[PDB]
From Swiss-Prot:
ADP-ribosyltransferase that mediates mono-ADP-ribosylation of glutamate residues on target proteins. In contrast to PARP1 and PARP2, it is not able to mediate poly-ADP-ribosylation. Has been shown to catalyze the mono-ADP-ribosylation of STAT1 at 'Glu-657' and 'Glu-705', thus decreasing STAT1 phosphorylation which negatively regulates pro-inflammatory cytokine production in macrophages in response to IFNG stimulation. Interacts with STAT6. Interacts with PARP10. Interacts with PARP9 in IFNG-stimulated macrophages; the interaction prevents PARP14-mediated STAT1 and STAT6 ADP-riboslylation. This is Protein mono-ADP-ribosyltransferase PARP14. Auto-ADP-ribosylated. Residues 10-181 form the Macro domain. Induction: Up-regulated by IFNG in macrophages. Down-regulated by IL4 in macrophages. It is found in: Nucleus; Cytoplasm. It comes from the Eukaryota. The gene is PARP14. A glycoprotein 3 binds at residues 29-30, 41, 52, 126-130, 165. Belongs to the ARTD/PARP family. Expressed in macrophages.
């Protein structure tokens, strides 16, 4: 009921429509991306600096690092929202890599609608040190978007890009997209 056709606008990039949203997966370094929100995949303390969280915090800068620690105090947070620092985004949403990926992506999508944001970039949450299986992660990310669209919640959000660090993970996402295509 929602899926378009998988196509490729550049080598190593694949996209398909999911309702009104363009869902893209691409190879690369997320810190090179521009989007309204960039998603960080971190630990329960929000001060992880290994893997994608290291790339993100080192590029975002020390003010963002301070923001994370401060917010982590305030509450028993499931995710936190900070400024983008020196990343090319309006906000970073920091989710926990070990947490349910579908829930995490749903939260991200909701927060983006709240801010009338149109673009999101995220990594393959949980597929590194968290050791969540890439196919389960892919399934969860795409499921979250499909559910969002089904519920009629997608109004401002128009583009969701997963930036993926290795071929092995890219191929899994592509397979999961291809399985769903109309
Ligand atoms: N610059 C980058 N851009 C995009 N993706 C990247 C980059 N660098 C790495 N990746 C990919 O980012 C993906 C995620 O790898 P990880 O950064 O380990 O995060 P997690 O979510 O698995 O674990 C985070 C915490 O969650 C749990 O508590 C765990 O115990 C951790 O403490 C991999 O595919 C990387 O190749």
């Amino acid at each position: 009921m929602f899926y378009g056709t998988v196509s490729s606008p550049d080598s190593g990039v694949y996209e398909m429509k999911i309702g009104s949203i363009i869902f893209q997966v691409a190879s690369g370094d997320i810190t090179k991306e521009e989007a309204d929100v960039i998603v960080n995949s971190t630990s329960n303390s929000f001060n992880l600096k290994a893997g994608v969280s290291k790339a993100i915090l080192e590029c975002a800068g020390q003010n963002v690092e301070r923001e994370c620690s401060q917010q982590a105090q305030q509450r028993k947070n499931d995710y936190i929202i900070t400024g983008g620092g020196f990343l090319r985004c309006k906000n970073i949403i920091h989710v926990i890599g070990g947490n349910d990926v579908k829930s995490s992506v749903s939260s991200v999508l909701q927060e983006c609608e709240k801010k009338n944001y149109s673009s999101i970039c995220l990594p393959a949450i949980g597929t590194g040190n968290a050791k969540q299986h890439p196919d389960k992660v892919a399934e969860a990310i795409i499921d979250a978007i499909e559910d969002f669209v089904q519920k009629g919640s997608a109004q401002s959000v128009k583009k969701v890009k997963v930036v993926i660090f290795l071929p092995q993970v890219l191929d899994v996402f592509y397979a999961n997209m291809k399985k769903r295509e109309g």
